Amino acid sequence: NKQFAVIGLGRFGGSICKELHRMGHEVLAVDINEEKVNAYASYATHAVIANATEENELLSLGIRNFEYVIVAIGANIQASTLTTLLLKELDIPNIWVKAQNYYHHKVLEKIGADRIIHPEKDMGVKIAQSLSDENVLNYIDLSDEYSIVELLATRKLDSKSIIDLNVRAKYGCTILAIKHHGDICLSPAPEDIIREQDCLVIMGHKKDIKRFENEGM
Amino acid sequence: NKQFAVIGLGRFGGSICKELHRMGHEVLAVDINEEKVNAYASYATHAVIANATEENELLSLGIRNFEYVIVAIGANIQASTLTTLLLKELDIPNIWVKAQNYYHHKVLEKIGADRIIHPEKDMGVKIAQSLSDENVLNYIDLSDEYSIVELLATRKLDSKSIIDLNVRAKYGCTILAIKHHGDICLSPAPEDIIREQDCLVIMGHKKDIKRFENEGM
Amino acid sequence: NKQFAVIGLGRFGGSICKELHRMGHEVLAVDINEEKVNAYASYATHAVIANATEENELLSLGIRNFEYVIVAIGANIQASTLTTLLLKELDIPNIWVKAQNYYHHKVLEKIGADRIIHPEKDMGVKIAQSLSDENVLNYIDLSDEYSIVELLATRKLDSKSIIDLNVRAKYGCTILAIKHHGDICLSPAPEDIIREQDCLVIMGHKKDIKRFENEGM
Amino acid sequence: NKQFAVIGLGRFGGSICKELHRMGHEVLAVDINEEKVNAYASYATHAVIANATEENELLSLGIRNFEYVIVAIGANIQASTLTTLLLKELDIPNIWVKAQNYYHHKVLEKIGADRIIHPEKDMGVKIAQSLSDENVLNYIDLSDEYSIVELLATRKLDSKSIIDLNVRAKYGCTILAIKHHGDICLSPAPEDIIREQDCLVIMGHKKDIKRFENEGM
Amino acid sequence: NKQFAVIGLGRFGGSICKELHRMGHEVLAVDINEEKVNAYASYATHAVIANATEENELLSLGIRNFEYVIVAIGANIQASTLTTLLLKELDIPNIWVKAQNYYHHKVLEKIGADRIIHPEKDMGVKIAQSLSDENVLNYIDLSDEYSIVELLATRKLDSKSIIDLNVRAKYGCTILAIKHHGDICLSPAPEDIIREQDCLVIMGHKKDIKRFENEGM
Amino acid sequence: NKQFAVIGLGRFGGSICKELHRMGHEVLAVDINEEKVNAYASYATHAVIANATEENELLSLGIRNFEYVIVAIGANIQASTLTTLLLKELDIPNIWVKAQNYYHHKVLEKIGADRIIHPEKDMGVKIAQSLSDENVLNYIDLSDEYSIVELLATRKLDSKSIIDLNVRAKYGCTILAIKHHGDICLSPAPEDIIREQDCLVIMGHKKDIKRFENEGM
Amino acid sequence: NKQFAVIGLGRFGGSICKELHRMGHEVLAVDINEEKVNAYASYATHAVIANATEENELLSLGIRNFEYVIVAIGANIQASTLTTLLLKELDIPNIWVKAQNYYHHKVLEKIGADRIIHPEKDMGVKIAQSLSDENVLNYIDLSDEYSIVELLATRKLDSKSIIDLNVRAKYGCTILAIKHHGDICLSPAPEDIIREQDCLVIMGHKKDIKRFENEGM
Amino acid sequence: NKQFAVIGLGRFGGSICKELHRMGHEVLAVDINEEKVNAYASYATHAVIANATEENELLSLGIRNFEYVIVAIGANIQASTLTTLLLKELDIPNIWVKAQNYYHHKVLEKIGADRIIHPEKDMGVKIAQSLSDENVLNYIDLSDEYSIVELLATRKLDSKSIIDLNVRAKYGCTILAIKHHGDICLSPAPEDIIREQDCLVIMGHKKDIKRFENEGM
Numbered sequence A, B, C, D, E, F, G, H: 001n002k003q004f005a006v007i008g009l010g011r012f013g014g015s016i017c018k019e020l021h022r023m024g025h026e027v028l029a030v031d032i033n034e035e036k037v038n039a040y041a042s043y044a045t046h047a048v049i050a051n052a053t054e055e056n057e058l059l060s061l062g063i064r065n066f067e068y069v070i071v072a073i074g075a076n077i078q079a080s081t082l083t084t085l086l087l088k089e090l091d092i093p094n095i096w097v098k099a100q101n102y103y104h105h106k107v108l109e110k111i112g113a114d115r116i117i118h119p120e121k122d123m124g125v126k127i128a129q130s131l132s133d134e135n136v137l138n139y140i141d142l143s144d145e146y147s148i149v150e151l152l153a154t155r156k157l158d159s160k161s162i163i164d165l166n167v168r169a170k171y172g173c174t175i176l177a178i179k180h181h182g183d184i185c186l187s188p189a190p191e192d193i194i195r196e197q198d199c200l201v202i203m204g205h206k207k208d209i210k211r212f213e214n215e216g217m
């Protein structure tokens, strides 16, 4: 009976609701706009036109029965703050709120939001990382110094090997997976071959990976 | 270094500009809102007020001299499409546009945009995956079936060494890194232990990682 | 069962719909404005209030059954582009779209519009031709050099003949029809007479016709 | 040369101004929108920002010195009517106004406009005639019953000479010109042949031309 | 069966309708505003919410049955012109239209309005006449030189007579009525007495009356 | 001469200002609309742009120096009331305000306005009286029962002398003046005749004048 | 059957209505906004959506039966003036109106409002008094010179007495009540003790109390 | 003296500023409306136009140098909250904010506002208490049960001495002061008399004061 409410159907909120309902979960789409409700109705377990700033409508949805509530309102700062304050004063266990600027994050922190999300800023940082380094496809920072990076193998790495491309001693990183033509190899053996336009999953220090990219690739 | 031009300062494009200049690149912050230009003036090389949909203002910016142009406008579909068409007529090597819906992405496809980004949608998918599983902190999908996952250790995981939790054979997964008290052990040994409320990096097929989440932690 | 849909009731679109329904054809008038629908209802086979940007309403009209669809929306550029993209992605054979500027024409070209029309620009060119040359009433350009021109015969041509006004040798043109008091003569004999304020249909090079106008008329 | 004044730069009036100056005439581009004046400044002799409905601004323009004044305003009915009345009070020899509906045309009639144009309506009639008959490319109506038509040749017409297709006696029409590969044969001979996807100019009564379209091609 | 229609309920139009219905006449109040119709309903024989610019609604009121129609719309110039043109083209015998400026009067003249009224301008002239001459209460100009004037008798005229105040020879005017305490005397005898604050009805040349006011009063 | 200040240039107040300056008085044209100030600048002594509801701007105008202040604002009830209150606080001898409805007149009464004018209402009463009786041209009501009336002569009145139409005894009225072909006979003799389409001035009780209109003409 | 009407639900008006209905009185909440009526419905004896500027709706509420009527409209000056004038002309005994500025107070005075209230100005004065004097909690001015003041006893007054803190002779004031930990003592005996952070109710001249605060506290 | 900064000039904050400067303090009048800054410029030391929600403008004002900051904005909830958060981040010792509703007060609580004021609510409570009891003029509540009350004397109270009205024993209350004809007797004697229409200060429990109001007056 785990329940998720998504207040504020937008790109972020609509994506959250659609992805949660695709997973086989109970989601209630809530938006003050009738058209947004009609849009995301077929992608949720329930869809109600409600003004989340209103305590009466909030109670009428059965908001108390939801373990998780996600306020994806990000453009209207005062509406998002009102919804978050109402949800806290109604004792919702987990409130995840989308922020707009740093002060919105501060005021959502002070009123007790469980998690505050900055989607656009994070994706902008990631896309900038992919912009300066045209090799990287995706990545994940384990810490401020260590990261796992997926990379497009260049012509310089075409038909090379795991011992021919030695990184555990020449650059300090290790190689974790290789994707060729759609088939993936995990924990690759020292004999495995990397080809041009393959996907390489390296892991180590940021500067180590960049050393490998400048010198190796 | 590299010639970047971020048209459309916003939460996404502004983050791109800020991070790319912290990276030390020539980033031209283009906006029509004077307050937007002033907000990111301290973070860019040149911050010019201009309407990108105007050909005269675009030639005034010298936008043909830039190798990378990023149209982060995603709310004004017409303005974004017009700017992308103007840049494609100007033979820009790389055009990266932010899209709003499927049809905006389609019209950006037809007019020759090089890379179309949907930040809010993908980040909402990620946050929904974190909502359905409170254990996962971050992840990267190698393919539609294989992934690397960051997890938060639980009471069922405290003082459990890597040899007690055989993931190499019980689930076909591999533990990649442990993070304890801000320090990090990369490629940990079978005798290394894990304490609760730590960051655990595992690699393998999605259902196998979920199997470990269910049975082990 | 040939079917024409006219989306965007306006001067151009309303004229297209009224002229097609006068011809004894099946036309569906579609406009987002209830008043425009009520206006052009009595001049069409069917009239429905629909938002053409909406895929659901577009499917509800039975848009798939129309062989020809005419998007006469010209002022709202983004709405016209959305309607055209939807009609293409719904596999409409012939899409005829009214344009507003040269970039609207380009974006309608890139998304696959079958025909793009610039009514106002064309009629402005024609009216300018009638403005500088007060003699011409209507015309048609066969090529960039040859044209057929209807002209008001001046007093200088009153009670003149086809051999008295020789143009097949004196100016290189030929005379094709003469309209006197409402009666018309085609392929006129060499003995036919032109009178003042008659309609003369000459045909030949533009400069040849202008020679005849300066010298003959 | 000739004194023209295009009040109301738009798709229609702007085309008039552009073409008339490519023709090399003194064309005064009058508009109230500064951006409209700047858009057509490179194509006119003088492009002044002015409100035509104001008598003081109209005397400032020296509009009484112009033989031809064209009020292309068709969306603001009141402004167009007021401008036409102001010009008629100023004894302008030729006033040509763009109209929107039947009643705007009637009030332009009553206040003494010399020529009223309905561009979109007539062009929509033409495009509707081209929609009902895909063969016709352009046409000019000599009278309500007689016309000259440009047609696109079909497979039924390839390698057919002018004597095989007797239009002079079988249908009472006459072929006027053939256009093949951008070259053009004017007043073609009976032994001249026509290939498919060519431009064919025929002349005659409307029903007779349609008879040839049905039976021949 | 004499019938009056009042289109445009306002101060002027509402006053016309209320005064006509007080007289025991058939009046139809017509206004596009539901509140104005509800207001002037109880003061008319009928009240209908109608958009007079619409020919269909105009016909639905039975506008053809009205001998007199008064378009009191004065602020919306284009709406008043449209209503007047419609009423003329529907062959209304008498059309009385309220004007706003001199050009509105001209355009209503050209489209065939039977009477054009300038209420505010006329009353402003009258109030200015009462302003400069504090003696005058009301008046009526018989011609540009002769007028009948009602005046407040001053202390200088208190307890004076018709032969004591001789005006048929001393100033060229005659005295026509005297109102004392509410009782009025017409064609007053030479023995009648004027008292302070009485109402005097003099008649003659403007300069003659002003002579009498400067010298006599 | 006299110190007048017309606050609120409009159709009423603008007429007051224009006529009063044609009369040669010091008329201060006060308005908040710059175009309104410019429109009546050529007709006044001083035309200042000012907001009358502001005490500082009112003391800047030197409005305490004026003996007569006319607030012609009748659409903005609040602004007119505030201006009247500001002038009454400034001890203006004569304040004449234009009113919109009964309640605006009441609040102008309570705050001490000297004279309240309802131009449109009274002029609509006059025009309604002219509509019910096409014979009357103008009139002045001496009392609720007695009046002077200007009439248009009919066929029943042509070549009728003043002794044939005994109004002195048959109806208790008196003919005051005749107007023929722009010339005027004042206080006409019993042998003076009247032709049709002339201006006839009669004086007497309302019902008696109507009796003559019915029986004589 | 004493009855209170509250027109203008706002902070001030809503507080008046809620406090009057808490007291066990008959209150009718009246607001032109449906949401305000729904809000203050559960806190009143009746709640009706009405436009108080309308005489018909005002009569429909039964406004004649209310002995007290409170116009809490303060932002819309003209609406408040209209409501007050209507209530006076309907002979309401007691009209209490909320004012906005000094001129609104003047115009409400002139139209006969029984009481005019300036809540925000009064509370601003009180809060300024508490701002400069951080000791005072609340007070009440008996006259422009004498006042009763509640004060927070400082550390300088901790464990002091009524004869140890002598004010009837040392500063001219008297002590009236002492509040310790929630228990209050009225007309305190000469032996009573004041403690730190207690509430002291002194009474006397303003300068006397300030002497005591500077010297004693 | 003391450093005050009133952000948000309004009826409340403007009164605070005016009174505090009449008190002779350094009061910085901060507003975004230029007319608001000009309105209170004559009553403050410095009156700067600034947007308080902007960090740059706030550091430009030198707001960190002020010991007391009063955000009187109560209609714009977002702007007030943002300003309060900006000041709390700047370590202002005393922040006093004006609130609109319970939730605005709650968010001001969470972000660390020192004192939150609800002027209209409390003043409406006071005016409601004065409406239910016409005798009370002002009052101060010592506790939820004890209060000091100012009353207006009635006919039942004229010529009644303090010993005839034993409030010390009949009701447990005490008369504190009498006010007659603008003069005031403080701490009056048992033989002092009271006349009607005087100001009487009584002290005691609420129900006891009401008992005296019922039985005595």
Ligand SMILES: Nc1ncnc2c1ncn2[C@@H]1O[C@H](COP(=O)(O)OP(=O)(O)OP(=O)(O)O)[C@@H](O)[C@H]1O
Pocket: A007, A008, A009, A010, A011, A012, A013, A014, A030, A031, A032, A033, A036, A050, A051, A052, A053, A072, A073, A074, A075, A076, A079, B120
């Ligand atoms: N009080 C409210 N109650 C319910 N829904 C609301 C309320 N206020 C706004 N919304 C809706 O929540 C959604 C949030 O979208 P909004 O445009 O405000 O933010 P955004 O940051 O641009 O969104 P995103 O990037 O997630 O698409 C909108 O669909 C909006 O209509």
Ligand SMILES: Nc1ncnc2c1ncn2[C@@H]1O[C@H](COP(=O)(O)OP(=O)(O)OP(=O)(O)O)[C@@H](O)[C@H]1O
Pocket: A120, B007, B008, B009, B010, B011, B012, B013, B030, B031, B032, B033, B036, B050, B051, B052, B053, B072, B073, B074, B075, B076, B079, B080, B098
């Ligand atoms: N010519 C232009 N046309 C449109 N937007 C422009 C233009 N020049 C600059 N911009 C900026 O582009 C930005 C992108 O628009 P907007 O912020 O409405 O869209 P969004 O994609 O929803 O934003 P975000 O990604 O920040 O959430 C705006 O901040 C706008 O000021």
Ligand SMILES: Nc1ncnc2c1ncn2[C@@H]1O[C@H](COP(=O)(O)OP(=O)(O)OP(=O)(O)O)[C@@H](O)[C@H]1O
Pocket: C007, C008, C009, C010, C011, C012, C013, C014, C030, C031, C032, C033, C036, C050, C051, C052, C053, C072, C073, C074, C075, C076, C079, D120
């Ligand atoms: N999404 C839509 N769906 C349906 N009809 C639409 C839509 N958007 C606009 N329309 C209608 O289509 C018509 C197009 O007129 P519009 O004023 O936009 O263009 P225009 O270039 O001025 O027209 P024209 O010259 O043909 O009269 C209008 O009646 C408009 O209301």
Ligand SMILES: Nc1ncnc2c1ncn2[C@@H]1O[C@H](COP(=O)(O)OP(=O)(O)OP(=O)(O)O)[C@@H](O)[C@H]1O
Pocket: C120, D007, D008, D009, D010, D011, D012, D013, D030, D031, D032, D033, D036, D050, D051, D052, D053, D072, D073, D074, D075, D076, D079, D080, D098
């Ligand atoms: N005084 C004026 N009054 C009205 N329009 C004016 C005036 N001066 C210039 N104009 C221009 O006249 C043009 C005609 O108006 P508009 O474009 O709305 O009408 P339209 O006939 O539908 O246009 P188009 O023929 O270009 O489709 C506008 O672009 C406007 O800027």
Ligand SMILES: Nc1ncnc2c1ncn2[C@@H]1O[C@H](COP(=O)(O)OP(=O)(O)OP(=O)(O)O)[C@@H](O)[C@H]1O
Pocket: E007, E008, E009, E010, E011, E012, E013, E014, E030, E031, E032, E033, E036, E050, E051, E052, E053, E072, E073, E074, E075, E076, E079, F120
């Ligand atoms: N098309 C229309 N059909 C019917 N009524 C209309 C139409 N357009 C306007 N009206 C109404 O006619 C009335 C004319 O008032 P308007 O304010 O336009 O003129 P005005 O000169 O200020 O009036 P007045 O001085 O007579 O009060 C208004 O009540 C308006 O709502």
Ligand SMILES: Nc1ncnc2c1ncn2[C@@H]1O[C@H](COP(=O)(O)OP(=O)(O)OP(=O)(O)O)[C@@H](O)[C@H]1O
Pocket: E120, F007, F008, F009, F010, F011, F012, F013, F030, F031, F032, F033, F036, F050, F051, F052, F053, F072, F073, F074, F075, F076, F079, F080, F098
């Ligand atoms: N401070 C002011 N407040 C209001 N109106 C002002 C002010 N200063 C000047 N005016 C002018 O007063 C005029 C009177 O207002 P408006 O024309 O709307 O009313 P009206 O009585 O219906 O007009 P009219 O009598 O001309 O028909 C306006 O033209 C306005 O520009």
Ligand SMILES: Nc1ncnc2c1ncn2[C@@H]1O[C@H](COP(=O)(O)OP(=O)(O)OP(=O)(O)O)[C@@H](O)[C@H]1O
Pocket: G007, G008, G009, G010, G011, G012, G013, G014, G030, G031, G032, G033, G036, G050, G051, G052, G053, G072, G073, G074, G075, G076, G079, H120
């Ligand atoms: N004509 C009317 N009839 C009834 N209610 C009205 C009318 N006009 C305004 N109101 C309502 O009266 C209330 C007065 O609030 P308003 O915002 O106008 O004043 P305010 O001074 O800001 O109020 P406050 O400080 O008391 O909250 C509002 O709820 C408004 O909707």
Ligand SMILES: Nc1ncnc2c1ncn2[C@@H]1O[C@H](COP(=O)(O)OP(=O)(O)OP(=O)(O)O)[C@@H](O)[C@H]1O
Pocket: G120, H007, H008, H009, H010, H011, H012, H013, H030, H031, H032, H033, H036, H050, H051, H052, H053, H072, H073, H074, H075, H076, H079, H080, H098
């Ligand atoms: N940055 C700012 N944000 C918001 N308001 C500001 C700002 N700077 C100045 N102000 C002023 O703060 C004032 C408070 O807002 P407003 O008057 O709408 O609220 P209110 O609490 O209902 O008012 P009042 O207490 O006077 O009745 C406004 O007059 C506004 O001009």
Ligand SMILES: [Tl+]
Pocket: A011, A120, B011, B120
């Ligand atoms: Tl966004």
Ligand SMILES: [Tl+]
Pocket: C011, C120, D011, D120
């Ligand atoms: Tl057009």
Ligand SMILES: [Tl+]
Pocket: E011, E120, F011, F120
């Ligand atoms: Tl008016």
Ligand SMILES: [Tl+]
Pocket: G011, G120, H011, H120
């Ligand atoms: Tl307030």
